Design a protein around this ligand. Sequence first.
Ligand code: OGA
Ligand code: MG
Ligand code: NI
Ligand code: ZN
Length: 331
Amino acid sequence: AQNPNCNIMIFHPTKEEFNDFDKYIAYMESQGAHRAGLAKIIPPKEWKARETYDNISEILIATPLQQVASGRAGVFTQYHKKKKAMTVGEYRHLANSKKYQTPPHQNFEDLERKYWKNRIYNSPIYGADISGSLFDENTKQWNLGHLGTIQDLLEKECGVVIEGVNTPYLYFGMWKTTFAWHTEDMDLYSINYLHLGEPKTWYVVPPEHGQRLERLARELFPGSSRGCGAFLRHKVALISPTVLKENGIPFNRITQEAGEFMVTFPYGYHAGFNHGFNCAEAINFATPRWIDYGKMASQCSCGEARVTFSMDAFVRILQPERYDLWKRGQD
Ligand SMILES: O=C(O)CNC(=O)C(=O)O
Ligand SMILES: [Mg+2]
Ligand code: NI
Ligand SMILES: [Zn+2]
């Protein structure tokens, strides 16, 4: 068995290996990368996503989100308070202000210490989930707006044609902006490219151990657990590495820098934080190996998780017994 300790693997494809996206994902899995739940891909030195980032300031963040925490430093939830619209140039200036800017630090480990000590005492503002792309149309390799669609994969594997579309999303971050513990919708893959700015630190639980994280979460968030049998689908709960270690939960960590891709694998729980002003692009995708995970994915039916149009068909075809209840949740 390849990668039996489920370590995060880092890949350096050549420009020739960067041509065929599906083939390279399958290669990474042949080396055991999926066992970690997360892999890093450093693009060949010849590649670029676009020529410059000098002209992005007029992108609008229609609904910036202030991430307000409740709980203790290592075990907290966050809710998202909607703020007034602002441009990316306006948001960058805000991120760099004395109130929000990254503090002085020695190295990534010192900054990580400061994050977990102090996150709950601040409310950073995140520009999340903005439909769009920063890849140039002429970038032919690993262009996250030109991937094979999940609808087409389901049709290729299972023969059923379904409605729905699959487009990327932009994220503009600042110091302490936080992504809560989650797997993807329908336990899909994700791919995330950090276009510019400061790093993103990730934490991940191997897919084979995901239920250990879920059992801890039910213990740590007991009210939320009674409310919903899949409350991590709400994407609001944080648990620190110290607390994970105290409870014996297997996990790994890695820091993504500008110019690097991360891939999350089916049923790989992940969480993390931004180091300072940055911009990322991410999208979900599927492979043949995903289908069995899609069929077994948990679902939120309490009404909180509310998701895209295109998840309807995935539930309807892969999970017909659950469909009626899940759709009641959506309506
Ligand atoms: O970058 C973020 O805020 C969160 N991203 C992801 O969870 C992802 O790419 O799967
Ligand atoms: Mg612009
Ligand atoms: Ni994710
Ligand atoms: Zn729910």
